[PDB]
UniProtKB/Swiss-Prot annotation, chain A:
Residues 19-27 are cytoplasmic. Residues 4-18 dip into the membrane without crossing it. Contains an N-terminal domain, a ligand-binding domain and a transmembrane domain. Agonist binding to the extracellular ligand-binding domains triggers channel gating. A hydrophobic region that gives rise to the prediction of a transmembrane span does not cross the membrane, but is part of a discontinuously helical region that dips into the membrane and is probably part of the pore and of the selectivity filter. It comes from the Eukaryota. The chain crosses the membrane at residues 28-44. Belongs to the glutamate-gated ion channel (TC 1.A.10.1) family. NR2A/GRIN2A subfamily. Detected in brain cortex, olfactory bulb, hippocampus including the dentate gyrus, striatum, thalamus, superior colliculus, inferior colliculus, midbrain and cerebellum (at protein level). Detected in brain cortex, hypothalamus and cerebellum. The record marks N17 as: Functional determinant of NMDA receptors. The gene is Grin2a. Heterotetramer. Forms heterotetrameric channels composed of two GluN1/zeta subunits (GRIN1), and two identical GluN2/epsilon subunits (GRIN2A, GRIN2B, GRIN2C or GRIN2D) or GluN3 subunits (GRIN3A or GRIN3B) (in vitro). Can also form heterotetrameric channels that contain at least two GluN1 subunits and at least two different GluN2 subunits (or a combination of one GluN2 and one GluN3 subunits) (in vitro). In vivo, the subunit composition may depend on the expression levels of the different subunits. Found in a complex with GRIN1, GRIN3A and PPP2CB. Found in a complex with GRIN1 and GRIN3B. It comes from Rattus norvegicus. Residues 2-23 are annotated as: Pore-forming. It is found in: Cell projection, Dendritic spine; Cell membrane; Synapse; Postsynaptic cell membrane. Component of N-methyl-D-aspartate (NMDA) receptors (NMDARs) that function as heterotetrameric, ligand-gated cation channels with high calcium permeability and voltage-dependent block by Mg(2+). NMDARs participate in synaptic plasticity for learning and memory formation by contributing to the slow phase of excitatory postsynaptic current, long-term synaptic potentiation, and learning. This is Glutamate receptor ionotropic, NMDA 2A.
Curated annotation (Swiss-Prot), chain B:
Residues 3-19 dip into the membrane without crossing it. Detected throughout the brain, in brain cortex, cerebellum, thalamus and olfactory bulb. It is found in: Cell membrane; Postsynaptic cell membrane; Synaptic cell membrane; Postsynaptic density membrane. This is Glutamate receptor ionotropic, NMDA 1. Heterotetramer; the NMDAR subunits are modular and harbor tiered domains that function in concert to regulate opening and closing of the cation-selective ion channel pore. Forms heterotetrameric channels composed of two GluN1/zeta subunits (GRIN1), and two identical GluN2/epsilon subunits (GRIN2A, GRIN2B, GRIN2C or GRIN2D) or GluN3 subunits (GRIN3A or GRIN3B) (in vitro). Can also form heterotetrameric channels that contain at least two GluN1 subunits and at least two different GluN2 subunits (or a combination of one GluN2 and one GluN3 subunits) (in vitro). Belongs to the glutamate-gated ion channel (TC 1.A.10.1) family. NR1/GRIN1 subfamily. It comes from Rattus norvegicus. The gene is Grin1. The chain crosses the membrane at residues 26-36. Residues 3-19 are annotated as: Pore-forming. Residues 20-25 are cytoplasmic. Component of N-methyl-D-aspartate (NMDA) receptors (NMDARs) that function as heterotetrameric, ligand-gated cation channels with high calcium permeability and voltage-dependent block by Mg(2+). NMDARs participate in synaptic plasticity for learning and memory formation by contributing to the long-term potentiation (LTP). Channel activation requires binding of the neurotransmitter L-glutamate to the GluN2 subunit, glycine or D-serine binding to the GluN1 subunit, plus membrane depolarization to eliminate channel inhibition by Mg(2+). A hydrophobic region that gives rise to the prediction of a transmembrane span does not cross the membrane, but is part of a discontinuously helical region that dips into the membrane and is probably part of the pore and of the selectivity filter.
Length: 44, 36
């Protein structure tokens, strides 16, 4: 109820694999895409 | 919801960016150190 536009800063901080953790939803969506992007950031 | 949460925490260990683990924290710490 507070991450309407804060998902932008969430993912933009998790670009570099360390940010402020906001609770990811239970819809299996954000966790999987952040896992793929985190694997890509490890590669980067 | 415990099963999906434990699955997502098992992904989150590898994600590199917690349920009741009274003896499972040893498993998690060995898996995480091995993964890194």
């Amino acid at each position: 109820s507070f991450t309407i536009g804060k998902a932008i800063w969430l993912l933009w901080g998790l670009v570099f694999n360390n940010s402020v953790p906001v609770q990811n939803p239970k819809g299996t969506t954000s966790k999987i895409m952040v896992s793929v992007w985190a694997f890509f950031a490890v590669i980067f | 919801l415990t099963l999906s949460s434990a699955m997502w925490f098992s992904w989150g260990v590898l994600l590199n960016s917690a349920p009741r683990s009274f003896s499972a924290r040893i498993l998690g710490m060995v898996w995480a150190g091995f993964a890194m």
